Amino acid sequence: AQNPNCNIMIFHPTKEEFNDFDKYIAYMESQGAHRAGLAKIIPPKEWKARETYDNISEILIATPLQQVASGRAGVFTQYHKKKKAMTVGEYRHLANSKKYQTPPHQNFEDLERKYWKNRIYNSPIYGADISGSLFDENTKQWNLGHLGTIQDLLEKECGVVIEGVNTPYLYFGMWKTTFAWHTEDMDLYSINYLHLGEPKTWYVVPPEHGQRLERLARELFPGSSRGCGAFLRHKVALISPTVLKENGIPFNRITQEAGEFMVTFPYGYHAGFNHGFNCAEAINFATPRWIDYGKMASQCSCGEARVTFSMDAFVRILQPERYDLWKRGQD
Ligand SMILES: O=C(O)CNC(=O)C(=O)O
Ligand SMILES: [Mg+2]
Ligand code: NI
Ligand SMILES: [Zn+2]
């Protein structure tokens, strides 16, 4: 069995190997990459996502989200308070202000320490989930707006034709902006490209041990667990590495830098934080190996998770027994 310890693997494809996206995902899996839940892909030196970023300040963040925490430093939830719209230029200036800027620090490890110690005492503002793309249309390799769609994958594998679309999203981060512990909708893959700026630290639980994290989360967030049998779908709970280690939960950590891709694999729980002002682009995708995870994915039916239009067909086809209850939580 490849990668039996479930370590995060880092890949350096050549320009030739960067042509065929599906083939390279399958290659990484042949080497056991999926067992970690997360992989890093460093593009060949000849590749570029676009020529410059010199012209991005006019993008609009319609609904910036202030991430307010409750709990203790290592075990907390965050809620998103909506803020007034601002441009990326306005947001970048805000990020770089004395109130929000990255503190002085020695290295990534020191910054990680400061994050876990101090995150709860601040409310950073995140520009998340903005539909759009920063890949140049002339970028032919690993262009996250030109991937094969999840609907087409389900149609190719299963023969059924469904509605829905699959587009990328932009994330504008600042110091301490936080992504809570989650798997993707329908336990899909994700791919994330860090276009510019400061790093993003990731934590991940191997898919084979995801239920260990779920059981700890039920213990640590007992009211939330009573409210909903899949409350991690709410994407609000944080648990630190120190707490994970204390409870014996297997996990790994890695820091993504600008110019790098990360792939999350089906049912790979992940969480993390941004080091400073940055911009990432991400999208969900499927492969044939996903289909069995899609069929088994948990679902939130309490009303909180509310998701895209395109998840309807996934539930309806893959999980017909669950469909009626889940759709009630959508409506
Ligand atoms: O970058 C972020 O804030 C969150 N991204 C992801 O969870 C992802 O790409 O799957
Ligand atoms: Mg612009
Ligand atoms: Ni994710
Ligand atoms: Zn729920």
PDB file of C-alpha atoms in Angstrom, residues 35 41 56 65 72 113 118 138 163 214 235 259 262 285-286 296-297:
ATOM      1  CA  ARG A  35      -4.246   8.920   1.805  1.00  0.00           C
ATOM      2  CA  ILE A  41       1.604  20.535  -6.552  1.00  0.00           C
ATOM      3  CA  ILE A  56      -6.861  43.313  -9.524  1.00  0.00           C
ATOM      4  CA  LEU A  65     -17.165  38.616   6.307  1.00  0.00           C
ATOM      5  CA  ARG A  72     -11.248  28.992  24.030  1.00  0.00           C
ATOM      6  CA  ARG A 113       2.121  29.724  17.531  1.00  0.00           C
ATOM      7  CA  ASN A 118      -4.248  34.872  19.804  1.00  0.00           C
ATOM      8  CA  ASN A 138      -4.634  31.694 -22.601  1.00  0.00           C
ATOM      9  CA  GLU A 163     -28.549  20.263 -14.550  1.00  0.00           C
ATOM     10  CA  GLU A 214     -16.098  13.802  13.810  1.00  0.00           C
ATOM     11  CA  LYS A 235     -18.106  25.193   8.492  1.00  0.00           C
ATOM     12  CA  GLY A 259       2.361  29.993  -6.989  1.00  0.00           C
ATOM     13  CA  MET A 262      -3.148  22.275  -3.166  1.00  0.00           C
ATOM     14  CA  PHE A 285     -13.921  18.609  -9.012  1.00  0.00           C
ATOM     15  CA  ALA A 286     -14.655  14.853  -9.332  1.00  0.00           C
ATOM     16  CA  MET A 296     -21.790   7.947   1.291  1.00  0.00           C
ATOM     17  CA  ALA A 297     -21.352  11.646   2.118  1.00  0.00           C
TER      18      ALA A 297
END
